[PDB]
C-alpha cells in the first residue's frame, strides 16, 4: 500500500519538523524579556464614537492617512468616516448585506467588501461622476469571503470560507493565484509590510505563511486548540500574532518557525475576534467576545489595559499607520476611537 | 463655530448621509427576515416557488408585509462561522421532505437523509444564536409520503416506531420526533405545517407564525414580554 507508506513519510516529516523546532529553541521570549521594564498600565479613553450603523459591525479598515476609516455592517452599508470630525465621507450601499470583511486600498482610491455572497466587490471612491460605484465583483470563491487585503490598486488577496486564499488582478477580475493547503475555513488574513508574504489563519487551528509571487505555503504554524479568527504581523514583518476561540493569543516567528508566547488569562474564556499590533509592536490589542478589547504586553504576556465600553462583541480592530489611535468596531453598531 | 466653509459643507453632507441611512434603517426594520434551512435540495425549491454562488435572496410581499427569505444552500462551510449573521432574523423556515425517511444521503455509508435533517434541526434549534428564534418547520412532499408509505414502512427509519402504517399516525410521529429535538420549549415554539407539491396556504402559515413573532417582539418592546 503506497498510501500507508506516504502517511508514514508524512508523519516522519512532521516529527522531523517538530524536532527541529524543539532543538532550535533554547531560551523562550519570556525568559529574556523578564529583565526589561514593563509598560505599566495602558489607559485609553474613547475619543470619538462613530454612530450611524444600524446592524452589527463586522469589519473595519484604517486608511493609510490614519484619518479615513471604512466600516462594514450587516445593514448593507459601507460607511467611510472622517475619524477626526466623525464625518461620514461616503455611504456605499452593498448588493449583499451579509458582509464579513472590508478593506481600504493603500492609495485610498478603492474599498473592498465581501461575505456570504462569495464575492469581493471593489468600489471606486474617486470617480468623475462624484459617486462611489462598483469597479468590479471578483467571483471564483466557492465559500464565504472572510477577509480581503489590497496589495495595490490592482492586486488584492482574499481569504475565504472555501479553505482557500486567492490573489486577484482587478483589471481582469481573474484568479491570478490560488493559495491552497488549509483544511478548515480561512477566517483571517494579514499582509506583510513589504507585501511579499502574507499569513492566513483558518479553522483547522493552523496558520500558514504564503508567498504572493510564488503561490505556495512556506511555513505552517500550529499551537492553537480552536479556530483562528484573527491574525496580524509584527510591524517589522518578521513575526505575527494570532487570535482564536480558545481565549489565547499566540505570537509566532517566521525565522524561528515557532510560537514565542501565549497571551491568555484565567478570567478570559471567550473567543478572540480581532488582533492588532501597536506601531512599535510592544502592545498587542485583541478584541474578545466578552465585549471589550484587552491590551497585551506583546513582550511580557501582561495585560497592559482593557478597552471597555462596547455593549456587544468587539468584532474588529485597527491601529492607524502612524500609531496615533486604535479603533474598535463591535456588534452594538458602534465604532470607538481610543488614545 | 470654528469651522470653515468646506468643513460646514462636509458636515452637511454627513448629515444628509445620516438622514438617508435613517430612512434605509426604517425601511429595513419593517421587512421580515427569514432564514431558509434544510438538508440538501429536499423542499426548499418548491417552497421558494410557492412564495415567489453564495446566499440566495428571495423577496415576496403578503398582506402589505415585505419578506426577506435567505437561502444558505450551496454554502458548504462551517455554519458556526457565519450562523451568527442571522441572529436577528424574524423566524427560521426549516424544510424537511417527508419522503426521504427511507432514502440514503449517498455521502456517507449507511447514512439516512431523515436523520441528517434531524441532526441539522437539532443543531439549528438548540443553537446559541437562535435561543428566542421561532422555527417554521415545513414537512414537505406529503403526497409522495402518502403514496410510498404503503410500499416501505417507517420502521426502517425509526426502529422504535410501533404505530400503524397510516399517513396520519406516522406524520404525527415524525412531527413529534422533530419537536422533541427542541430543548428550549420554555422560550421558543415550533410551527409545523404539512405542505403538498402545490400548496397555497404555506404563505399564510408563514404569515401567521411571523405575526406571532412580531406580537412577541412588540410585547417585549413594551415591557410585557
Amino acid at each position, epitope marked *: 500500500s503506497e498510501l500507508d507508506q506516504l502517511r508514514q513519510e508524512a508523519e516522519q516529516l512532521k516529527n522531523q519538523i517538530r524536532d527541529a523546532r524543539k532543538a532550535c529553541a533554547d531560551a523562550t521570549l519570556s525568559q529574556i524579556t523578564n529583565n526589561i521594564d514593563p509598560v505599566g498600565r495602558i489607559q485609553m479613553r474613547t475619543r470619538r464614537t462613530l454612530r450611524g450603523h444600524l446592524a452589527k459591525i463586522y469589519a473595519m479598515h484604517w486608511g493609510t492617512d490614519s484619518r479615513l476609516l471604512v466600516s462594514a455592517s450587516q445593514d448593507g452599508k459601507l460607511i467611510i468616516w*472622517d475619524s477626526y470630525t466623525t464625518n461620514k*465621507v*461616503h455611504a456605499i450601499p452593498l448588493r449583499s448585506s451579509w458582509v464579513m470583511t472590508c478593506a481600504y486600498a493603500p492609495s485610498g482610491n478603492y474599498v473592498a467588501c465581501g461575505g456570504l455572497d462569495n464575492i469581493c466587490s471593489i468600489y471606486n471612491l474617486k470617480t468623475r*461622476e462624484g*459617486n462611489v460605484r462598483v469597479s468590479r465583483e471578483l467571483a471564483g470563491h466557492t465559500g464565504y469571503l472572510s477577509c480581503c487585503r489590497f496589495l495595490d490598486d490592482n492586486q488584492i488577496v482574499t481569504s475565504s470560507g472555501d479553505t482557500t486564499c486567492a490573489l486577484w488582478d482587478i483589471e481582469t477580475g481573474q484568479q491570478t493565484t490560488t493559495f491552497t493547503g488549509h483544511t478548515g475555513d480561512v477566517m483571517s488574513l494579514s499582509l506583510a509590510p513589504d507585501t511579499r508574504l502574507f499569513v492566513s489563519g483558518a479553522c483547522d487551528a493552523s496558520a500558514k505563511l504564503w508567498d504572493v509571487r510564488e503561490g505556495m505555503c512556506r511555513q505552517t504554524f500550529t499551537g492553537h486548540e480552536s479556530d483562528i479568527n484573527a491574525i496580524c504581523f509584527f510591524p517589522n514583518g518578521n513575526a505575527f500574532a494570532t487570535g482564536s476561540d480558545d481565549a489565547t493569543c499566540r505570537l509566532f516567528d517566521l525565522r524561528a518557525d515557532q510560537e514565542l508566547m501565549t497571551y491568555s488569562h484565567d478570567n478570559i474564556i471567550c473567543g478572540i475576534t480581532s488582533v492588532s499590533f501597536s506601531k512599535s509592536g510592544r502592545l498587542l490589542l485583541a478584541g474578545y467576545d466578552d465585549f471589550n478589547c484587552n491590551v497585551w504586553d506583546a513582550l511580557k504576556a501582561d495585560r497592559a489595559g482593557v478597552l471597555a465600553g462596547h455593549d456587544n462583541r468587539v468584532s474588529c480592530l485597527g491601529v492607524t499607520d502612524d500609531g496615533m489611535a486604535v479603533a474598535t468596531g463591535s456588534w452594538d453598531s458602534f465604532l470607538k476611537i481610543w488614545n | 463655530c470654528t469651522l470653515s466653509a*468646506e*468643513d460646514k*459643507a462636509a458636515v452637511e*453632507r454627513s448629515k444628509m448621509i445620516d438622514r438617508n441611512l435613517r430612512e434605509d434603517g426604517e425601511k429595513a426594520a419593517r421587512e421580515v427576515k427569514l432564514l431558509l434551512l434544510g438538508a440538501g435540495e429536499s423542499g426548499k425549491n418548491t417552497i421558494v416557488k410557492q412564495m415567489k454562488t453564495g446566499i440566495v435572496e428571495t423577496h415576496f410581499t403578503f398582506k402589505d408585509l415585505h419578506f426577506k427569505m435567505f437561502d444558505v444552500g450551496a454554502q458548504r462551510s462551517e455554519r458556526k462561522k457565519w450562523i451568527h449573521c442571522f441572529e436577528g432574523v424574524t423566524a427560521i423556515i426549516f424544510c424537511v421532505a417527508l419522503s426521504d425517511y427511507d432514502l440514503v444521503l449517498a455521502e456517507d455509508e449507511e447514512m439516512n437523509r431523515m436523520h441528517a435533517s434531524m441532526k441539522l434541526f437539532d443543531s439549528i434549534c438548540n443553537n446559541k444564536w437562535f435561543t428566542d428564534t421561532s422555527i417554521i418547520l415545513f414537512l414537505n412532499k406529503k403526497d409522495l409520503f402518502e403514496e410510498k408509505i404503503k410500499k416501505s414502512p417507517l420502521t426502517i427509519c425509526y426502529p422504535e416506531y410501533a404505530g400503524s402504517n397510516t399517513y396520519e399516525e406516522a406524520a404525527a410521529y415524525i412531527q413529534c420526533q422533530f419537536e422533541d429535538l427542541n430543548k428550549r420549549k420554555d422560550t421558543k415554539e415550533i410551527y409545523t405545517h404539512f405542505t403538498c407539491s402545490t400548496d397555497t396556504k404555506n404563505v399564510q402559515f408563514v404569515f401567521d407564525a411571523v405575526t406571532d413573532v412580531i406580537i412577541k417582539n412588540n410585547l417585549k418592546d413594551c415591557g410585557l414580554f
Partner: single-chain antibody
Amino acid sequence: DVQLVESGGGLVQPGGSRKLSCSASGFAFSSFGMHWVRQAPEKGLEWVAYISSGSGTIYYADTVKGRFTISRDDPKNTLFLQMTSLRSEDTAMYYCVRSIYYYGSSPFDFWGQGTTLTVSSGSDIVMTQATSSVPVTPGESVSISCRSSKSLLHSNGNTYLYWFLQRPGQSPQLLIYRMSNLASGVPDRFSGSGSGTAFTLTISRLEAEDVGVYYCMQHLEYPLTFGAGTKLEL
C-alpha cells in the same frame, strides 16, 4: 462624460427679469453643491450664488443678494438662477460650477461652458495678484503670485486657495484646489505652494497649452472672492 450646459442668456432691458438654467449630465447632480460664477466682459471672475446638496444651504454675493434666486431640481438635474431687477453691471457670462465637499474632495473641479447675458442701457477677503499680464517663453518656468487680505490657513491645517486657468474662448478649469493639491486631469508640471497670505503657482516647462488667464480663489469663508487674473502671453 460630465457636462454642464447653460441656457437662458440674452439681451435684457434694465430692470427686467430672466431665469438661467443649467442642465447637468454625466454625474450625480444631487450629491454636488452648485455655484453660479459670472465673468464680466472686463475679464473678471465673480462668484454669484451657491446652493448646497439638498438645498439646505444657500449663499449669495452681496451685490445680488435679495435680487437673485438660486434653486435646483434634482429629479431633472437642473440648476436655476432666477434673476430679477437686472441692471447694467449684471452683463456677464454666467458659469454653472460643480463642487463637492468632503474630506479630500476637489470642489470647483468642473465648470460649465457658460451662458452670456447682456443688459442694455468691506469685510470680504480681498484676493490680489500683483501681475495682470506677463509674457512667457514656452518651455521655461513661470510663477504666478497671489496675495490675500486674510490668512487662508485654517485651524484644521487646510489653506483654502484655489487656482483656475481659463484658456481663451474656454471655461475655467481647476488646477490646484487647496494651495498644493494637483487636480484631476491636469499635468504634474503645475505646482502650487505658499503659506498664510502669500501664494504662488509654478508652471515648469510651459507650453502653448497653458496660455490663458490664471485666477486665485479663496474658499475660507463666503463670499468666495477671485483674483484679478494673471494672463500669460506669447
